[PDB]
Every structure is written in structure tokens, then in C-alpha cells.
């Protein structure tokens, strides 16, 4: 899932920046501090969208920086258990297929791709009885079955009804019409 969060914080502005635009300076500091961070509860911080409020600066002894209370908005990516997702296969190995979900990828272990005997062809995952094939570039619909975010592993499966490579789903619809 993707979310926009409203966050209250206190931003430290060094004296070397006192001549620059306050909002731009605060935004830059927030970007350097939080973008790229991965939090188990919050998710992956993708962007500091905007700074919505900046209070008066406070100065504490022994410190030359100005501490400003602020409220900023941020876009985050957060995987959720049992979530239905759609993504692109970016790597296929003998033990599974990696699927891009945004800034993070999920892994469909080789035994969770399809209900069939599969084999990895060094020269895509192929089903022996169905002929179904999964290779880099394919779009898939899957479900998250395991999450381990470390400030990482996201496990995916398509071995449930209504899941699979998009083309397989479209074919099923055609037959059922």
C-alpha cells in the first residue's frame, strides 16, 4: 500500500543556513534525514512531499542551531499482510521470482508460482504440465504472505485462486466468460 503521512517534528537548522529560504532549507534537511529510511511500522520513506508548517526557532545553550517545530507531509510505501498486489517480475532464479512492488521487491518462492511441476530454464520458470511460463518483465497479481522489514524480506504467492501472471488471469476469464 501507499500512504501520505502528516508528521510533527523538530528540525535543526544550522547557522550556516540562516540566509537561505527557511522552508526550502527545512525541506532539504528533512529529505536528507528521512528519505530512504525503512521503518517496520511506518514503511519506506519515498518523499518529503511538502512542509506544511514551520514554527519559530528555539535556541538552546551550547548549540548554535535553530530548532523549529514543523509539520511535514511524506509519501511512504508499506507492505501489509495478506495484501493483494500487482507488480513486475525483475529477476527469475531457480528458487523463485522477484517482483517489484515499488522501492522494495517481493519474492515468489519457486513452489508458490503455480500449481504444477516447475523447472528453472537458465536460457524463466516453466510448468511441465501446463506450459505456463513466468519470466522477467511479466506482470503478476499476487498476495503478500510474509513480511520482515529491517531498518528485508517480503514473501509472495500466486498459488491461490484469482492470482497469477495477468495473462493467465485474463485467459481464465475468457474461458469462464
Amino acid at each position: 500500500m501507499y500512504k501520505i503521512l502528516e508528521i510533527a517534528d523538530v528540525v535543526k537548522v544550522p547557522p550556516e543556513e540562516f540566509g537561505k529560504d527557511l522552508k526550502e532549507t527545512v525541506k532539504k534537511i528533512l529529505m536528507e534525514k528521512y528519505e530512504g529510511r525503512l521503518d517496520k511500522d511506518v514503511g519506506f520513506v519515498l518523499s518529503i512531499v511538502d512542509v506544511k508548517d514551520i514554527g519559530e526557532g528555539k535556541v538552546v545553550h551550547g548549540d548554535g542551531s535553530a530548532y523549529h517545530p514543523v509539520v511535514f507531509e511524506t509519501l511512504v510505501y508499506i507492505p501489509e499482510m495478506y495484501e493483494l498486489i500487482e507488480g513486475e517480475v525483475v529477476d527469475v532464479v531457480e528458487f523463485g521470482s522477484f517482483v517489484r512492488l515499488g522501492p522494495l521487491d517481493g519474492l515468489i518462492h519457486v513452489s508458490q508460482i503455480m500449481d504444477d511441476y516447475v523447472s528453472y530454464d537458465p536460457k524463466a520458470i516453466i510448468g511441465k504440465e501446463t506450459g505456463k511460463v513466468l519470466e522477467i518483465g511479466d506482470y503478476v497479481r499476487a498476495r503478500i504472505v510474509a513480511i520482515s522489514l529491517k531498518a528485508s524480506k517480503i514473501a509472495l504467492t500466486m498459488r491461490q485462486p484469482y492470482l497469477g501472471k495477468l495473462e493467465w488471469i485474463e485467459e481464465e476469464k475468457a474461458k469462464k466468460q
Binding site: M1, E6, F44, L46, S47, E86, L101
Partner: protein
């Protein structure tokens, strides 16, 4: 932790997130992961931001929770089976058909 406290949140569609990331890329170079996110978002956004947000609003007007409305807007289900995929371990909505009509209505 991220900030002193999270005041509130809003689930957003992939379509809207894609435009938000597009704007971020206009103010500075993206990291590798931010770049992957932009690529993913642009490829899986099935509507522009305006339409996606309009769809979510319509679905919410029917009493559909925010998270689910967003997921529906992201997936754009075409039949009952697609809805069954979304409503995992959940009973299908009594308004299942109306949802499909609206989705098949982003038009």
C-alpha cells in the same frame, strides 16, 4: 523514529503516488530505490491522478472503507472473481455489482 509523532494518514492510489513521485523527481536526483518506485508507480497506475481520486470518492460514497476503495481503484476489477481477490477472507459486498459498474465506469 520518523518525527516526533504521526498526526494522521491517508491511503493513496498508485495513480496519485505516481504523480507525487514525479514531482519529487523534478526537484532533485532520485536514489536507486526512489527511482524503482517511480518506475513501478508509472507502470501500474491505471488512471491519471484526477480520475483515480474521483473513483475512490465514488466508492467511498457507497460506504466502502478507504483502504479497500483505494485497492479497488488500483486493481480496477472487471468481474466478481477480481473482487473476491480483493475481499480476501472477507464476504463479498452486497453491492458487488454496483462496484463493477462504477469501475467499468471510469468513463
Amino acid at each position: 523514529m520518523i518525527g516526533k509523532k504521526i498526526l494522521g494518514e491517508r491511503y493513496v492510489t498508485v495513480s496519485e503516488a505516481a504523480e507525487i513521485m514525479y514531482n519529487r523527481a523534478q526537484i532533485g536526483e532520485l536514489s536507486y530505490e526512489q527511482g524503482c518506485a517511480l518506475d513501478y508507480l508509472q507502470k501500474f497506475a491505471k488512471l491519471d491522478k484526477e480520475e483515480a481520486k474521483k473513483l475512490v470518492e465514488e466508492l467511498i460514497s457507497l460506504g466502502i472503507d478507504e483502504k479497500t476503495a483505494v485497492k479497488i481503484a488500483d486493481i480496477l476489477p472487471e468481474d466478481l472473481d477480481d473482487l473476491r481477490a480483493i475481499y480476501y477472507k472477507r464476504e463479498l459486498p452486497e453491492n458487488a455489482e454496483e462496484i463493477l459498474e462504477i469501475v467499468r465506469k471510469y468513463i
